[PDB]
Design a protein around this ligand. Sequence first.
Ligand code: AMP
Ligand code: MG
Length: 413
Amino acid sequence: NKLTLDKLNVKGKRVVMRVDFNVPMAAAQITNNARIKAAVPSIKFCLDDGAKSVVLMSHLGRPDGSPMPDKYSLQPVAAELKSALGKAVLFLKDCVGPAVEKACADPAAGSVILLENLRFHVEEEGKGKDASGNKAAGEPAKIKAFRASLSALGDVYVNDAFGTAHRAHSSMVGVNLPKKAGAFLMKKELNYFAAAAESPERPFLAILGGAKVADKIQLINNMLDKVNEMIIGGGMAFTFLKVLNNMEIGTSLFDEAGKKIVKNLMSKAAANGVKITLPVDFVTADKFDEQAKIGQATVASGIPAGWMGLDCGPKSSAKYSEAVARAKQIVWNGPVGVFEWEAFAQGTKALMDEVVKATSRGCITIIGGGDTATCCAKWNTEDNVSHVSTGGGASLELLEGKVLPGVDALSNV
Ligand SMILES: Nc1ncnc2c1ncn2[C@@H]1O[C@H](COP(=O)(O)O)[C@@H](O)[C@H]1O
Ligand SMILES: [Mg+2]
């Protein structure tokens, strides 16, 4: 129940749109467009429906509030967006101030304008570091002024920056305009997660991977309140196997703080009637290196001193596949092994194959932002799963059961 773009009247209006263009880069070059392309359907909707202008605003990297036009400029994105949009883009060297306001005042109808990095101003995050590297605090009156300037750039506001929705930054919660609508990406992201957090199809399987356990306690706990099954893989699994089974784990990752909560998580799973699938075999490595000598092990055999489990084995792949086969809805957050290294990416690759097949027969498959999304990109499965999230931190907070400041700030329907 929140206002979305498709239900917003834009004809003859200046649209001030927050987008998450915080794209990866490398030596003044974009290394992945995804976030830019993800926001194009919203930009076009506005143009096609007669918007007077669409003023795009975003942050890039973490300049921590000082104009770093040399390393963190959004200028390259303007030329990239012009190619994707097939339309000229007016790039402005600032995002607030009299001159920027004057430029967005009465733009030529159909104008697309891209503002400079919002994080060049400490008022966006509300805090930062000075030149010396010292932490500086934003001033309240300056915060108000900054927000009032952004508000002048449009008659209506659209937030399509899902990747930034967990941030209560000025551009996300401070735009004072009567109409604040979530755009098409934001809509899609919330639509699917509404699936995971409210009315999931069943069985509902949650696949949780990664290294640390302590930072995922809430994610695991929240998911235990909603799923029918849960696969616990990746490095996390070793804390569970060590505690529950007393498995010899070698130099495999072990979370000391998290190990103290393992029995409590299993207890909840039991009470909620959740079937937990943990790995039973592994692909070992003599060291955490892409080219480390590899081996094999099982929970029963244990992992040799010095060696570490970096991926699940064949038997674990079977059990995982069986869980996927039983699911009508799946939420996957975190690969099941070191996917970055080919030798330890096979379990993840195999699981992806199963998730893709599940989607083909009607399973609603939701891939979390970040690492899992990167895997979809690497193996070209974006068009093969139901949803691939554009925001790692944002989707994690949602799966944790948290309210997103950027979503909460939107108008209601
Ligand atoms: N069995 C494992 N051992 C060590 N690292 C793993 C393992 N499985 C997944 N990972 C890594 O954990 C990651 C994400 O960890 P996290 O920051 O907790 O999300 C990726 O960098 C993976 O390479
Ligand atoms: Mg990660």
